[PDB]
Amino acid sequence: TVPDRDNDGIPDSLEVEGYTVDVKNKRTFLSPWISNIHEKKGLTKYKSSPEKWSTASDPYSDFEKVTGRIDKNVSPEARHPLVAAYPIVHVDMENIILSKNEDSQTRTISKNTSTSRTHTSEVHGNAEVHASFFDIGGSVSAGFSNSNSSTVAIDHSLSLAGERTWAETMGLNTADTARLNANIRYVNTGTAPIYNVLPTTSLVLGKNQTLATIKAKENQLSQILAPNNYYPSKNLAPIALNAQDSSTPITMNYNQFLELEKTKQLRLDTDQVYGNIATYNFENGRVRVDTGSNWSEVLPQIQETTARIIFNGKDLNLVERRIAAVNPSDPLETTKPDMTLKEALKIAFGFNEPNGNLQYQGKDITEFDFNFDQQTSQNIKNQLAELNATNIYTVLDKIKLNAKMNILIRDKRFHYDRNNIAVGADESVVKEAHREVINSSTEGLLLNIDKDIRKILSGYIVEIEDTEGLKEVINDRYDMLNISSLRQDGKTFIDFKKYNDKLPLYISNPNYKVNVYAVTKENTIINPSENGDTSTNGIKKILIFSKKGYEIG
Amino acid sequence: TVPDRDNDGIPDSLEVEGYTVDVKNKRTFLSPWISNIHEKKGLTKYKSSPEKWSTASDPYSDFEKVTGRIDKNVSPEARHPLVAAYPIVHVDMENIILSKNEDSQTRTISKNTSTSRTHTSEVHGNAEVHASFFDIGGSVSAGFSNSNSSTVAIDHSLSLAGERTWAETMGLNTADTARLNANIRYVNTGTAPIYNVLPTTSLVLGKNQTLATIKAKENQLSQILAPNNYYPSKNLAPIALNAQDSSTPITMNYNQFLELEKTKQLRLDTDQVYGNIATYNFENGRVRVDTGSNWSEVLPQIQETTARIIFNGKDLNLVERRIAAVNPSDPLETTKPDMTLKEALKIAFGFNEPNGNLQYQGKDITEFDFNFDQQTSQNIKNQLAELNATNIYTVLDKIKLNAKMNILIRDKRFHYDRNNIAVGADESVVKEAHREVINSSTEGLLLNIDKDIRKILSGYIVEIEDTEGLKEVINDRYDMLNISSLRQDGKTFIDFKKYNDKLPLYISNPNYKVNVYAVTKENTIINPSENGDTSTNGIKKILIFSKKGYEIG
Ligand SMILES: [Ca+2]
Ligand SMILES: [Ca+2]
Ligand SMILES: [Ca+2]
Ligand SMILES: [Ca+2]
């Protein structure tokens, strides 16, 4: 009569004091922690709640997880009892194509786009918010809350000849209407797979101008949207918007269009209506989809009993993950094991302990900026109070975590915008990343630029300095910055030629200086100034390259 | 064979005499009250009925609640056995847009709106009511009864240039028809979440002119309408009326329109057809939606066995909550624990006992006005009789509560209208709240105005007094009061500039007086007098600011 209140399979004693699953001959034993023999083999000290089926609340029993008798598609780190295993799906727009609503073969602009999961944070301290902002639950979005929003930025450069004025290039006048079309793909950033129904993501423009809502039919798809995997597998045909399937295309009047040309960006607000869930079956050991248990029902619970932490180390992409945090008010939830901001980061993402420090694959914890909400803030400030210390990174392994807590560990190296996106770092860094020259030619530059940094650079600027001090720039236009291409060999490649009429640079005197600059996204522009200054005049460029002419080719 | 008639899980003895749930190691124990050790740890003395599953009648077992093995979305205070845990959803209209039913880019008026849950109370003592008002159950609305009604007020100010006459601004004549459109969002004020089906709320105008009934399709939504949470999360795209989804727009003939322009307000009568309910499952511990148990069935019961109290402390918003009140006639309902108007207020909202007094987060109970219905009135008056006392606030912890009883505890500081809405307080208060000046400029005023009070002020008036006694007002129009904007830093900001042509004030003599007044909603007007007096002449303004010219900038 071994005690098991949750009836999960893991006896209370274990679930509460500690345990781990291990394999003897070929069989697997669920044994209690043994600092002696266990820590050696490499196992893990699993500690869950004895009174809950799945301590996270997600559709997977603490037993099912640790043991491995679960939907193999569930994320690894989510295989751990205190790591919420749910989906997180947003939409990526690879590129778009704009034209005139119905001899139309050269009257169109097809430019690419860059999309990223956004995490819109509150304003400054003087926004005209309605008097309902200071009420309970109402308007108090508290910085960041549950929901999906991806922001697309459209390529401002040039694709054709010497094209100019998006408007005329298409042939648009106050009495015309421009139609939009694009290629997108759903992408699951979460820790659990979606099996059928897809999110009814809507495309917004500006602040509330809903351009269209894509709700690609249900069950039409049987392909799985596994964690870290794009809907139509990156090696397949992306989904196109209002390009087939649909009788009502996309309408965008003049005024609206102008705005698009003004910011050259859109937003993708996606809901959470994911499909039913795939559950295990102890009987035959097959994973099936329970037409009864659908995420929309099981998600809230997770969200109401987990510490959520957003992090961007793996890549400058925001990653969400929830940990099994406790809660004073809820007796049951007070059964969940105690959570430390340290341990959280260890299993929630991957941080580890080398020789005593807490770093994330090299980068030390101290290299990231912690961000919370009003609630979480206090709840922590008050813990630092009763522990006497000002530098949190010290007591990091003593900061208790409670459910409903929201955290945002981000890389300190870069600057971020409203949507907490990487926008560009300090000079000291940008240079430090270009300190590797491979091939110097009058055609371009080949470097071993750091995959990360480069993601914060709009483009480059190439000029030539006279022996006395001149400023002649080859690509002298706001939209002639797009030059750095990326080879699959893992090396960034610049090309002066693309914007010099197929022909290489011009060395008037092999004693001159060939300058190349980088333009961070936060400093780069997308349109001519008030007048019509279409030149790299008023730009905050950066000294990336500066070698003589006899040191190239 | 421990006795459990309700078969809930809590043994009679406990349920009747007292108990509380607590956590030992990581397990949770359901133990009886122990004034000694319990009161210390901070637990609560739970006392429910031994013969009822859920003493409130709501879909949640007394056990499920106290223990926490329930839909995590259920409100906290409703986690207590004697606090009805049901939904309460009304509709908020952020703003509207009026035009002429079909070169229409400058022939429209888009003004914002302010909506609030109303609690329409009876008339005075001379209303022409049909002879059926004094019958049983018939017409005896008894002051306030179950149902949802939200009142919207439309911004009367100006948005464009020097616009005038709503009629002509759109181009309306006896032979034309104006169409309406607006953005709204459902909002759940209750204590329990709705999971799918949404209320068939209808938009009324005046007294019975049903403008349109919005019944946004069922199951189309899977997003949850949690307690204190707006339908499309405040951080999302509000729902628009007859703007897509719909073939029959909104029609409003001349006569009707005029009325709108006359009171500039509408009403939103919403039903209670909420969705099915989310119930817990002891087995695996998952929360699912029982296609069998739908609120429409489970609500009545609550309503017929609970003391309902409306309160507005959290904010000047009416909050409804029901407590497990007893009932003499019903044997079963006579099993419910005894309820005191004190305890009720303690768990129903949050009132507590500091050093012996009963206050609600600072404000003392004595600062609110108690309001009942004919029935509840007597039932209490008769309790004061057999207890010899005239001041109720004394015997507050001795006023028994019976089911079907209706109560309305409201803040005494302000004045209220028909719908029991905050409309404006006494002078002594308005001033007291503006006793904090931060930045004085010839452009505007920055103050630390109390979030609460400000919610009762239509706008401000700015004039200049000569050294002898002149009355020159900058913004001298009924609709030029809208000036106080609110910064997210938590400070109210006034702007003289908005109504002085972008340019700051004019100090003819730095020894003059710069006056600023506030206009309470109850005193403010929305249209020109009989003739055409579009000036702040006949208005009951209030002395808010009065500083010299050399004490500003
Ligand atoms: Ca267990
Ligand atoms: Ca368990
Ligand atoms: Ca019982
Ligand atoms: Ca009971």
Coordinates of C-alpha atoms and ligand atoms in Angstrom, one line a residue, chain B residues 6 8 15 49-53 55 62, ligand 4:
Chain B
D6 CA -23.2 16.3 1.4
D8 CA -18.3 16.6 -0.5
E15 CA -18.2 21.8 8.0
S49 CA -23.1 23.6 5.2
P50 CA -22.7 19.9 5.8
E51 CA -25.8 19.1 3.7
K52 CA -24.9 21.0 0.6
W53 CA -22.2 20.2 -2.1
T55 CA -23.0 26.0 -0.1
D62 CA -17.0 23.5 -0.7
Ligands
CA4 CA -21.2 20.8 2.1

